[PDB]
Amino acid sequence: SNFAIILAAGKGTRMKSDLPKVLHKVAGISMLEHVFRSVGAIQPEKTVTVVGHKAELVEEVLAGQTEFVTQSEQLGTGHAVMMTEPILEGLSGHTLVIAGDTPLITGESLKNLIDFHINHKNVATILTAETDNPFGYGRIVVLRIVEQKDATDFEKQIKEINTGTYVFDNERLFEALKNINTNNAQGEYYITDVIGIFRETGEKVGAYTLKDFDESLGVNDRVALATAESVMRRRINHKHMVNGVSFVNPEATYIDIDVEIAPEVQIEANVILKGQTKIGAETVLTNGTYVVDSTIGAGAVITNSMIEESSVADGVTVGPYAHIRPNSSLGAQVHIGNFVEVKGSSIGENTKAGHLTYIGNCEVGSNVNFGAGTITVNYDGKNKYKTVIGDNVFVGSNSTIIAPVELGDNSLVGAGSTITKDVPADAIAIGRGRQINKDE
Amino acid sequence: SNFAIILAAGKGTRMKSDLPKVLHKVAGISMLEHVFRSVGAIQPEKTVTVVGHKAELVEEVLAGQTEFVTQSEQLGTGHAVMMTEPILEGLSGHTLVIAGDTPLITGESLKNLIDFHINHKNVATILTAETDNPFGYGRIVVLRIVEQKDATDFEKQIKEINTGTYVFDNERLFEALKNINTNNAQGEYYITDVIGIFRETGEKVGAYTLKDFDESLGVNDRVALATAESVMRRRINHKHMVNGVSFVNPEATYIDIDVEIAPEVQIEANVILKGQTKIGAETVLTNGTYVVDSTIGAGAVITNSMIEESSVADGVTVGPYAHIRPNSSLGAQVHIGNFVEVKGSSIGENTKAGHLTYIGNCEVGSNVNFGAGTITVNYDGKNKYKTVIGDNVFVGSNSTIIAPVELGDNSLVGAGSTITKDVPADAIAIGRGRQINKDE
Amino acid sequence: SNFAIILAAGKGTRMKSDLPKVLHKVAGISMLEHVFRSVGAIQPEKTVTVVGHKAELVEEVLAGQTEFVTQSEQLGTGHAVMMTEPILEGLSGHTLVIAGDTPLITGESLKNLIDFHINHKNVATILTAETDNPFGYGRIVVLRIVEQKDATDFEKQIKEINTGTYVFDNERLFEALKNINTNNAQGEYYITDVIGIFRETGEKVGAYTLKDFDESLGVNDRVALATAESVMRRRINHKHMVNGVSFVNPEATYIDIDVEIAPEVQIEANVILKGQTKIGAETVLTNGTYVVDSTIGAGAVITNSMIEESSVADGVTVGPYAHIRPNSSLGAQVHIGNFVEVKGSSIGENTKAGHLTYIGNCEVGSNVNFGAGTITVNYDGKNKYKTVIGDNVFVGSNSTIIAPVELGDNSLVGAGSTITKDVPADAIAIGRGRQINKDE
Ligand SMILES: [Ca+2]
Ligand SMILES: [Ca+2]
Ligand SMILES: [Ca+2]
Ligand SMILES: [Ca+2]
């Protein structure tokens, strides 16, 4: 009963990019994916995306749930939708035609668009909006969509404009296109021509007006791309605020569309949350914090730090200026202070690494203490090695732990030491020279 | 002659918080405290705050200057103000009734509110404002405050709305409430009912209209809380700019309400100043700088750094990426470079710690030089120790100074050394091994 | 044929600064320089800047291309322009009179201003604009410029105001001033008085209206200075976006007026680019990145780092939290990780310094590897020294390389070592003590 056609064929030269226009991201995902998500709201029985230049590229990612069709020749929107003929020809119902570059339209508006369509038995309904600066846009007279050039000194005053989003009765849509194309006397034909045909035939043409004009934004250049990110950012942050998350400045906090955040979390300005990130209850995120594809538990405090593809338990304190790199896990109540880098290591609960430390490829136990300046070495030039540090070990400041090596439970390393051999449990490893003063 | 009643009883379920609503902060202090500060402007002979859930909590901080009264049962604003009867009953004068959730109202407006009250001998004056979207708010007809539901197809057009802030003649206020409550035929009664009673009795009811509608904002959820921080931020930064402080972007700089800043200071965007912080003349604060409960002198340059509960003299340069922790003091012209952490230490003038260094619990003299990579160790596992470093000492790069220990004036430590014993004045301490090459 | 007079004499007491008002910067250069750049658009045969207090200071920088004249006495704008008499007296043509504190006016508007001037043969044309809050500004009746005080209950309604920018026929301009000054019966005389004289004489006085009122902004205090930076920031970022640069938030990115950025560059919010900075194609700049007077190549990724007066080749990755200091050069595909400081050193291609490292005054070859914690020492107290590190050298973690010293190609340093003597090619230098365990 409901069908959807997504127009996603290049031609976006104002973007000054080699990437297909619809692949440019907005709050974490491509414009095309935001459009697929809105389209899902109408629960279309079938969906077809017309692609073009770098066709496979657009398919080489956001594929699967959707049928694709390629157009090797660009002859306008009419032609583009004509390329979906092989799949929608004959079926009865309602067909939504939408551009892959209008990422701000919501599922709720698409739905209101169809409802209106049916509630008036229209043959075609134009999604429209009102602006005080109609310049350029096609004007809505419903009788006909007058273009800017073909507009009369009078018509150039119509506030209501065409958003380029439509709903047509599937049977008549392909008919009109088939017709226009042959008796067009021109090469390229636009989808708005079909609106012209229903005018001739006296068929019913409705128009749904959007409440918010800004949701109709079509992205043609990077100025409109930034505007899209601005609206999407406000939308995302608004939902988080209604859900109990505090923002010092929601106009300057950057949270991707799929990030999950528990109520009571507090977010200072200029925090960045990307990908599949998740934040537990009562966690505090301070200015400069940057988190990507990670999980942060409840009661944590992340201070001006960078966390990537890692997991952080409840009550962890990180920062300021720490870097938690891929595949690290920080156990409950762990503390990572300033200028510490943790990479590919698991760290047991209550362990502390408060300063200028590098921990890579280690399995670390609980209640371990890393003195300021501790460095793990697990790279020789071609191969890496792992290090095991037991529970309750004390690693003196400015030490160098050279892997492969193991430190047993409760062992201790003296400051300034260089460890090259296993240190047994309860032992004490020292590898530093003796001090020698010299008067005058 | 002037009395004030502050309504601060829970019921804020849209906040999704376990903290009493009025305790949520805006620019450094609770909404309740911003309201107390505005209220002080009318110089009320007596002030009473009606609290409720977590009553003690609200008292367990912002107490002292104000009388509190608890309401174990929530039966509306009428009931809430009725709880202050034991204290304001009988007194003559003017009584301001204000919610603890309207933190943007200024003392100047409260004052204009009273003046208006007296200048018209009103019995009650409603603080009002005009908006183009009156939906939801009580409409002002002065005759009566028509609610959204009880509003006629006509009345729902009144632009002027009720802010919920009022001034009543104290004697008649408690009378009407006492009355309504008994012949109410209902449990809960609203303070706006008193406006209804004065209508019956034909008493004079005025209305003061605020010039700025946004100052009337009542905070019910975290979206309005962010709006309150946005307005308060602009207000605070505006005053600093009029006072000679330059801001690269005052819409994105976060300065708490009590921070003091001398004229000629320059502030880049995204700087955060909290608590009792004070900044001296001509100081430059760059992007990312975060200062809490600290004092910074004149002529300093703080570059992307974090400073907490410390004192910084004139001409100090800090950063980028340095962390000055609690109870540290940096003398005149001291320089702390990148990746340096200073914790609980005093540092004499002209001393320099330019790179990757950790200085904790030390008393440091003047003209000292910390080579890159120097680490102080004053933690054994259960106990801490102090270190004294005299004037003009040179601490070679990558050294480890293990406390307790002392370095005498003009002494010197060789790079890569580990110091465990006192180093006498003018001496030279070395604790590093010898280098051994190996051909091929 | 075209002449220009720039009014830049102090009197800006609301700025609370000891610097001449026009010297305050906006997006990297003084307000005066933005005005010179707009003025150049009219291609003036001669340009004269009237200075005053700290006269030399204004000349001690933005000099050269312009004639200066000092006024030791402040008797108004009429007097100020009278000081340029010695140079413009007698010449025929058109003379633009503009204040050094209106940095937002564009060259395109100045040009439209002259065109209008000539297209109407006016004797004088007032650059005007319309605002809904004319309060304070001089009203435009063209007949006369009525001031706020001398305005009639009616005139105080004129929406069109005087921007203080004018074009006069050079011959008549000095005539009227010469006249007014003698029969003024007052000390100070304003340039708007000349508009009064042409009214008496019945001469033609036109007015060009600006499309954007905000471009007329005169900066008198730091609140308007921030507004100027806000408009200039939007203008600069807009041009970059039209040119192919992506901005996550162009309202919070700080790019100086002369920074050059190649298309396809991606810029996260809160990035700062200053001075003569240049960014190559497809480079990614993340939140917190701060670049000053540097060149970054194509395909680089700068993550939250500070780069000053340096050069960075193609494919370099820097950050997070690295500091590249003055006079450093990073070769192609070099990698500088977190907490690394590079100062005055050249670094060959593919070299890697991934953690907690300080590299100063070194010449480093290609394919070198700096293990975490490596420190170069080239400071003794009064003198500095250089270090040469050949190609393919491996510098073990936590080492100390003490200059002057040299490491030959393919040599290697063992971790925890202190190097004080040259290390020959293919050799292996070790300077660490031996580890000694201790049971229980
Ligand atoms: Ca274990
Ligand atoms: Ca001393
Ligand atoms: Ca070579
Ligand atoms: Ca070290």
User: With the C-alpha atoms ordered B90, B91, B96, B97, is the resulting torsion angle positive or negative?
Assistant: negative
**C233 shares its domain with C132:** yes
**C279 shares its domain with C209:** no
Tell whether B230 lies on the interface with C, counting CB pairs under 8 A: no
Experimental method, per PDB record:
X-ray
**B297 shares its domain with B162:** no
**B299 shares its domain with B190:** no
Residue of A nearest to B421 (CA): A435
By DSSP bridging, strand C323-324 and strand B387-389 are unpaired
B439 located within any domain: no
Peptide bond into A320 cis (omega under 30): yes
**A236 shares its domain with A263:** no
Chain C contacts of A290, Cβ < 8 Å?
286-287, 304, 320
The torsion angles phi and psi of A330, rounded to 5 degrees, stand at: -115, 120
Domain boundary among B244, B275, B295: B244
Task: Select from C285, C352, C392, C432 the residue whose CB has the most chain A CBs within 10 Å, as the one to mutate to test that interface.
Answer: C432
Q: What is the 3-state secondary structure (H, E, C) of chain B?
A: CEEEEEECCCCCHHHCCCCCHHHCEECCEEHHHHHHHHHHCCCCCEEEEEECCCHHHHHCCCCCCCEEEECCCCCHHHHHHHCCHHHHCCCCCEEEEEECCCCCCCHHHHHHHHHHHHHCCCCEEEEEEECCCCCCCCEECCCCEECCCCCCCCHHHCCEEEEEEEEEEHHHHHHHHHHHHHCCCCCCCCCHHHHHHHHHCCCCEEEEECCCHHHHCCCCCHHHHHHHHHHHHHHHHHHHHHCCCEECCHHHCEECCCCEECCCCEECCCCEEECCCEECCCCEECCCCEEECCEECCCCEECCCEEECCEECCCCEECCCCEECCCCEECCCCEEEEEEEEECCEECCCCEEEEEEEEECEEECCCCEECCCCEEECECCCCECCEEECCCCEECCCCEEECCEEECCCCEECCCCEECCCECCCCEEECCCCCECCCC
C440 located within any domain: no
**A302 shares its domain with A417:** yes
All partners of chain C with 3 or more CB pairs under 8 angstroms: A, B
Q: Please say whether the beta carbons of B285 and B267 come within 8 A.
A: yes
**B179 shares its domain with B57:** yes
CA A16 to chain C, closest CA, distance in angstroms equals 5
Tokens of residue C319, six digits: 């950050």
**B306 shares its domain with B413:** yes
Tell whether C428 lies on the interface with A, counting CB pairs under 8 A: no
**A71 shares its domain with A111:** yes
C221 located within any domain: yes
All partners of chain B with 3 or more CB pairs under 8 angstroms: A, C
Domain boundary among C197, C214, C244: C244
Ligand 4 centroid to Cα of residue C286, in Å, is: 29
Q: In this structure, what CATH number is given to the domain that contains residue B258?
A: 2.160.10.10
Q: Is B53 one of the annotated active-site residues of the chain?
A: no
A176 located within any domain: yes
Q: How many domains does chain C have?
A: 2
Cross-strand partners of A285: A267, A302
Task: Tally helices (H) and strands (E) across chain C.
Answer: 8, 39
Ligand 4 centroid to Cα of residue B398, in Å, is: 5
b vs e for B220-237, b when ≥16 Cβ sit within 10 Å of the residue's Cβ? ebbbbbbbbbbbbbeebb
Tell whether A434 lies on the interface with B, counting CB pairs under 8 A: yes
**A177 shares its domain with A214:** yes
Interatomic CA distance for residues B3 and B96, integer angstroms: 6
Q: Please say whether the beta carbons of C402 and C408 come within 8 A.
A: no
Quote the DSSP letter at residue C113. H
Q: How far apart are the first and last CA of chain A?
A: 96
Deposited resolution, Å = 2.3
Q: In this structure, what CATH number is given to the domain that contains residue C7?
A: 3.90.550.10
Tell whether C438 lies on the interface with A, counting CB pairs under 8 A: yes
B438 located within any domain: no
Q: Please say whether the beta carbons of C280 and C296 come within 8 A.
A: yes
**C71 shares its domain with C218:** yes
CA B111 to chain A, closest CA, distance in angstroms equals 30
Chain B contacts of C412, Cβ < 8 Å?
none
Ligand 4 centroid to Cα of residue C372, in Å, is: 9
B423 located within any domain: yes
Domain boundary among C244, C266, C281: C244
Q: Which listed ligand is nearest to C374 at the C-alpha?
A: 4
B163 located within any domain: yes
Residue of B nearest to A321 (CA): B321
Interatomic CA distance for residues C95 and C80, integer angstroms: 14
A438 located within any domain: no
**Residue C289's domain spans which residues?**
245-433
Task: Select from C17, C256, C357, C377 the residue whose CB has the most chain B CBs within 10 Å, as the one to mutate to test that interface.
Answer: C377
Coil, strand or helix at C108: helix
Q: What does each C-alpha distance from B183 to B90, B108, B179 come to in angstroms?
A: 21, 38, 6
**A167 shares its domain with A27:** yes
Q: Please say whether the beta carbons of C101 and C80 come within 8 A.
A: no
Peptide bond into A103 cis (omega under 30): no
Interface of B with C in 77-96 (CB under 8 A): none
Q: What does each C-alpha distance from C296 to C246, C270, C313 come to in angstroms?
A: 17, 18, 6
